Amino acid sequence: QTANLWERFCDWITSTENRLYIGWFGVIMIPTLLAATICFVIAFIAAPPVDIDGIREPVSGSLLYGNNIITAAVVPSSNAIGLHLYPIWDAASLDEWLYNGGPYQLIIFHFLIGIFCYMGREWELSYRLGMRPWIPVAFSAPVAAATAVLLIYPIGQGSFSDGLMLGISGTFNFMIVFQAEHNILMHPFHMLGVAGVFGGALFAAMHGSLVTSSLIRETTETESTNYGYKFGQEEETYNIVAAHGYFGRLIFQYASFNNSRSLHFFLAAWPVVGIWFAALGISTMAFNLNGFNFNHSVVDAQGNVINTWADIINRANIGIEVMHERNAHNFPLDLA
Amino acid sequence: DQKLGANVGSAQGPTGLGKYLMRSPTGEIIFGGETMRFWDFRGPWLEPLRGPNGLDLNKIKNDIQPWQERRAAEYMTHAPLGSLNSVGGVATEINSVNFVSPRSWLATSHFVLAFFFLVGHLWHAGRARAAAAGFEKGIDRESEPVLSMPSLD
Amino acid sequence: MEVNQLGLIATALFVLVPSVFLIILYVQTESQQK
């Protein structure tokens, strides 16, 4: 029967017994992530130089063409393409497709589909396991950030040639140009982002150290204390009342969590919200609502500008501005 | 530059592409420089200069009216770039012009709102599933599903 | 590319010496009486 054979397939797709869960989101995730990974690996090793800025000035990204791990990248599609979709079959040849940065588009579009399905797949398995459903809400923060730099920013600026370049030094290039063109350091959503990752690292170390500090003695002086916990044991492995007694004295009593559910909600919420704001920073500077501009904000009684540290930032921004893409501008304003 | 005597059709820019005019990847005549990416743009002040092949060099040489020069100067100087405190211009601009485009205000606000509403969709969709199935308050200790599953390995 | 000629031996020993240390410790743990 068709209905039985299809139901057998549905049961296998959604099975809680597969070593790696597949699921319906996984039916999309698996082919798209495989296509993106295979293309990325081949391009990172072997792709010829790519004319990222559409000025017939090809940038070499691959290892075989003179890069190391730190300088290699998969280079964005050409500025001549802009936001046009550039699949392989629209090129006259693979040679043309490679010159124009075809691999980048294939990789980023399959990757983005893949991570959105990865997020849905986190919802799906939690449903199959009888868990609560909000782990994908936490993962939506890195997903939103990846989508900001690979999709929203190029849309706002009119070209995938301005999206994040897929390499270590390419990432730094994206960041430095971004600072000149948006003053992202002076944007409060990036500031919230920094509080998110500085605070997330701080709270990770804090939480890690407090639980580690109050582990109950269950091991001898020889073995690792890790053997004092057995996977799946019912009893808690540390004395949370001892941990709270330390931390409440370190600061003051009411500044400390005694409710482990509140504590772990806070650990989730702080970095997640911080990265949501980081992603919204990129996604709104994508439409050129930029960081605070206090250039020449302080003026003396006669009218002379009295510089502030904001003005010193501006001098660095100008140095980046005038140098970046040094052959690409013919007219006096960089308007995208 | 054409008013100064430049032959804008034959002017080669530093890269070898036309400084003012070049071809799109399918051959249409378009504006050069970084704005090569924006050749899909269409607007009433520009279309009188466009023909079947793209921008028409004869119309460019002979038929640009003052109202088009005015509109292009106005729009170049009201580009939708500006700071959060509404200082108009590129990020390196000095204070003077109090400007952020309505297009930037409307695009940014509605991206922020659309994004959190997608988060709200995920939140309430996941919760509605878990509540309909009866485990939105947590795992039943006496009936934990994973404890009834075969180990993965 | 004109890379440093000692980069290859540096990388090889950087990988090999600590990896081998860990493999030695792992295998002799497995072989201990259970």
Binding site: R19, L63 | - | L8, A12
Partner: peptide
């Protein structure tokens, strides 16, 4: 020789992923 070195290390990492997942110490309730 440097490209070989980089690709070799990468390949060893991917192999490690495979063993870390499919040949892990099985988690066991006791």
């Amino acid at each position: 020789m440097e490209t070989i070195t980089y690709v070799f290390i990468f390949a060893c990492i991917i192999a490690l992923f495979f063993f870390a997942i499919f040949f892990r110490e099985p988690p066991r309730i006791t």
